[PDB]
Design an enzyme around this catalytic site. Structure first.
Site, PDB file in Angstrom:
ATOM      1  N   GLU A  55       0.845  -1.189   0.000  1.00  0.00           N
ATOM      2  CA  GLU A  55       0.000   0.000   0.000  1.00  0.00           C
ATOM      3  C   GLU A  55       0.892   1.254   0.000  1.00  0.00           C
ATOM      4  OE1 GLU A  55      -1.787   1.688   3.916  1.00  0.00           O
ATOM      5  OE2 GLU A  55      -3.388   0.566   2.905  1.00  0.00           O
ATOM      6  N   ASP A 230      -5.800  -4.467  -3.643  1.00  0.00           N
ATOM      7  CA  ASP A 230      -6.099  -3.037  -3.754  1.00  0.00           C
ATOM      8  C   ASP A 230      -4.828  -2.212  -4.020  1.00  0.00           C
ATOM      9  OD1 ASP A 230      -5.201  -3.494  -1.051  1.00  0.00           O
ATOM     10  OD2 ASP A 230      -6.277  -1.732  -0.347  1.00  0.00           O
TER      11      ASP A 230
HETATM   12  O1  LIG Z   1      -6.889  -1.354   7.443  1.00  0.00           O
HETATM   13  C1  LIG Z   1      -7.280  -0.177   6.760  1.00  0.00           C
HETATM   14  C2  LIG Z   1      -6.208   0.906   6.869  1.00  0.00           C
HETATM   15  O2  LIG Z   1      -6.197   1.362   8.231  1.00  0.00           O
HETATM   16  C3  LIG Z   1      -5.329   2.483   8.433  1.00  0.00           C
HETATM   17  O3  LIG Z   1      -5.343   2.789   9.774  1.00  0.00           O
HETATM   18  C4  LIG Z   1      -6.475   3.479  10.306  1.00  0.00           C
HETATM   19  C5  LIG Z   1      -7.169   2.558  11.316  1.00  0.00           C
HETATM   20  O4  LIG Z   1      -7.775   1.463  10.637  1.00  0.00           O
HETATM   21  C6  LIG Z   1      -8.222   3.339  12.093  1.00  0.00           C
HETATM   22  O5  LIG Z   1      -8.771   2.525  13.118  1.00  0.00           O
HETATM   23  C7  LIG Z   1      -7.590   4.583  12.712  1.00  0.00           C
HETATM   24  O6  LIG Z   1      -8.572   5.319  13.341  1.00  0.00           O
HETATM   25  O7  LIG Z   1      -7.037   5.408  11.690  1.00  0.00           O
HETATM   26  C8  LIG Z   1      -5.970   4.758  10.981  1.00  0.00           C
HETATM   27  C9  LIG Z   1      -5.407   5.769   9.999  1.00  0.00           C
HETATM   28  O8  LIG Z   1      -6.361   6.121   9.010  1.00  0.00           O
HETATM   29  C10 LIG Z   1      -3.900   2.114   8.064  1.00  0.00           C
HETATM   30  O9  LIG Z   1      -3.063   3.247   8.265  1.00  0.00           O
HETATM   31  C11 LIG Z   1      -3.824   1.641   6.619  1.00  0.00           C
HETATM   32  O10 LIG Z   1      -2.494   1.231   6.344  1.00  0.00           O
HETATM   33  C12 LIG Z   1      -4.799   0.461   6.457  1.00  0.00           C
HETATM   34  O11 LIG Z   1      -4.819   0.027   5.111  1.00  0.00           O
END
Ligand SMILES: OC[C@H]1O[C@@H](O[C@H]2[C@H](O)[C@@H](O)[C@H](O)O[C@@H]2CO)[C@H](O)[C@@H](O)[C@@H]1O
Ligand SMILES: [Ca+2]
Length: 629
Positions: A55, A230
């Protein structure tokens, strides 16, 4: 010559680009690999700040593409592809063609059930359960001349923090690792990090293998990789724009286009049910394409023997709307420059484009938000789909596909990441299906953006669901899903999500002319620039509500199983998250976090996630290009 861009927003992109690439800021490792975040005390999807993901790599590509657009220099974009191929796509040494060439397309893998609690693992392999056949392997070996797969493994221990090293040497960097292996209830806090290349040198008597799979015999030394579809699709999406922008300036990224095209060709493995069972008739082994749902599923994985020659490949039966990319599907099926070499490459992607648009529409709630997805494997064991569970091509609806701790569709980010791709498609083609989806979704989200008198703002953070969509009838189409509703549980100021939201609204406003969307996008961009800038990009303070799990989350280890992590940490029943990652106690933020937990407070952090910083930078460039005046 490229069209003129709005100087104000172009300058913000350049400033952010400089901050992200600044060696003093520490976003990259010495090998040129971007970390998940600058800060190391980080648990959310990856469980350490300095591991990277496919990602992050796809965002690195998008960032460099946009930079080539403004500077005329695309060598940074080509470099992002070189680093990806060198470190994230398993090499000849990592996925020995000797084993890969022993793959049997008529028996791709051996079935193993999935369970709803990590305590039910290891899952036992069952050779008597039917497995369908792989119709695309022969297309790929014929076009590329190899049995190795060209796709990115999803997570990488960049600095060898876990100590597994490269191919069991314990000393080299980067280090291929994997985490999630035990079902929907296995959160990031409940995994046992393991090496992709398992020679039994670490962990237990047989490495970490018998923690997840149980066989009749003794586990062999073996490698295994897992793709995040993705991310591979976002890489194709980013490369398309780099190709367009390069061509407008008489430049070329031909070599990167060929890699993106090859990746999109292998990415089709995600269109198939995990064990190639027929879509809609899960009890029967597939005969080829009848096992293709044509959606970008949760993953495709592959592996094989290290000291004995054999291999396997699996797709995934679980589909989440958040992973779809109709734009990448459009590129690979219609653009001549991105036509995959394989015989059915472009046409399979043409089938995926249609199926993806049908999937989004079927999942659109009464309000406008997109619901979870569907699975061809109920409970991950191909069980009977209950009562009046609505279906999409025989696949039952699931509110939170794949993960339940927390639910995969409770994060608002999925809404923006996915709908942004639909906005790009609509912008490029004016597609009626994309328009109908966006008109309704945009109206919903525009009513959920809150701007405060002091310049700050809030957008949906956690969302919840009720009901289910009406069973999809391709000829009737969208019924309006009157009994499917989204609920916003809480709001927040997630800068990455807000940037992704601004991007989506900008593409949509450029095509539709909707003023509401354009001013909300600009206001989001302006608010972030003016009130959240810092020397490293942008940031805000956020609460880490689950950090208590560092200390109180027990990790399941089967009865009688004991092993050691490379640093000596003992793995055995009773261990907590921190017990098998004791190096975390040396983190600069450790005392501060524990002190907060001791005082009964929720820990807070100011984080610089690579993807969020890039998302913001890209969002500024998009606005500069689409709204020059
Ligand atoms: O798994 C989806 C996505 O999550 C991202 O982190 C989020 C987290 O899921 C959420 O609970 C928190 O509140 O915010 C963080 C940041 O947006 C993570 O950074 C991604 O790498 C991941 O694909
Ligand atoms: Ca759990």
């Amino acid at each position: 010559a490229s069209s003129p861009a709005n100087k104000v927003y172009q300058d913000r992109f350049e400033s952010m680009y400089s901050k992200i690439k600044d060696p003093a800021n520490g976003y990259f490792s010495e090998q040129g690999i971007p970390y998940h975040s600058i800060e190391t005390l980080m648990v959310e999807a990856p469980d350490y700040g300095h591991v990277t993901t496919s990602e992050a790599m796809s965002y690195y590509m998008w960032l460099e593409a946009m930079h080539g657009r403004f500077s005329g220099d695309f060598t940074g974009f080509d470099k992002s592809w070189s680093v990806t191929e060198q470190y994230l796509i398993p090499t000849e040494k990592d996925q020995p063609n000797t084993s890969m060439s022993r793959y049997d397309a008529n028996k791709p893998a051996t079935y193993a059930p999935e369970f709803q609690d990590p305590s039910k693992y290891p899952s036992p392999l069952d050779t008597s359960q039917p497995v369908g056949r792989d119709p695309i392997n022969s297309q790929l070996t014929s076009a590329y001349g190899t049995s190795m797969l060209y796709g990115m493994h999803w997570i990488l221990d960049v600095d060898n923090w876990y100590g597994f090293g490269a191919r069991a040497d314990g000393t080299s960097k980067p280090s291929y690792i994997n985490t999630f292996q035990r079902g929907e209830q296995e959160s990031t806090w409940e995994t046992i990090p393991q090496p992709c290349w398992d020679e039994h040198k670490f962990g237990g008597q047989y490495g970490f293998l018998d923690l997840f799979t149980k066989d009749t015999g003794t586990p062999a030394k073996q490698f295994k990789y897992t793709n995040a579809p993705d991310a591979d699709a976002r890489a194709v999406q980013a490369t398309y724009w780099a190709d367009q922008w390069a061509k407008e300036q008489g430049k070329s990224v031909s070599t990167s286009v060929g890699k993106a095209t090859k990746m999109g060709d292998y990415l089709r493995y995600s269109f198939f049910d995990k064990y190639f069972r027929k879509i809609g008739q899960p009890s029967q082994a597939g005969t080829g394409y009848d096992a293709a749902h044509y959606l970008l599923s949760w993953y495709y994985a592959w592996g094989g023997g290290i000291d004995s020659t054999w291999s396997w490949i699996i797709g995934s039966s679980h589909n989440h709307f958040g992973y779809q990319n109709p734009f990448a599907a459009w590129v690979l099926s219609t653009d001549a420059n991105f036509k995959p070499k394989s015989s059915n490459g472009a046409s399979d992607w043409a089938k995926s484009l249609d199926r993806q648009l049908e999937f989004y529409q079927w999942l659109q709630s009464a309000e406008g938000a997109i619901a979870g997805g569907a699975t061809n494997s109920w409970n991950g064991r191909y069980e009977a789909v209950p009562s009046g569970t609505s279906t999409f091509y025989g696949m039952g609806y699931v509110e939170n596909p794949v993960y339940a701790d927390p639910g995969s569709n409770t994060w608002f980010g999925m809404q923006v990441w996915s709908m942004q791709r639909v906005a790009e498609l609509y912008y490029k083609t004016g597609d009626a299906r994309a328009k109908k989806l966006l008109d309704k979704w945009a109206k919903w989200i525009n009513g959920e953006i809150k701007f405060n008198a002091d310049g700050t703002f809030q957008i949906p953070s956690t969302i919840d669901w009720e009901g289910q969509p009406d069973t999809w009838n391709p000829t009737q189409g969208y019924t309006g899903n009157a009994n499917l509703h989204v609920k916003v549980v809480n709001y927040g100021t997630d800068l990455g999500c807000a940037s992704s939201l601004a991007n989506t609204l900008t593409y949509y406003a450029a095509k539709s002319g909707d003023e509401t969307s354009r001013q909300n996008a600009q206001k989001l961009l302006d608010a972030m620039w003016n009130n959240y800038s810092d020397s490293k990009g942008i940031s805000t303070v956020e609460q880490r509500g689950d950090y208590h799990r560092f200390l109180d989350q027990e990790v399941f280890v089967p009865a009688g199983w004991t092993g050691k992590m490379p640093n000596g940490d003992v793995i055995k029943s009773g261990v907590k998250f921190i017990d098998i990652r004791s190096k975390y106690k040396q983190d600069p933020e450790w005392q501060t976090m524990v002190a907060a937990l001791q005082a009964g407070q929720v820990p807070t952090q100011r984080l610089h996630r690579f993807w969020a910083q890039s998302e913001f930078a890209v969002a500024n460039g998009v606005y500069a290009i689409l709204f020059p005046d």
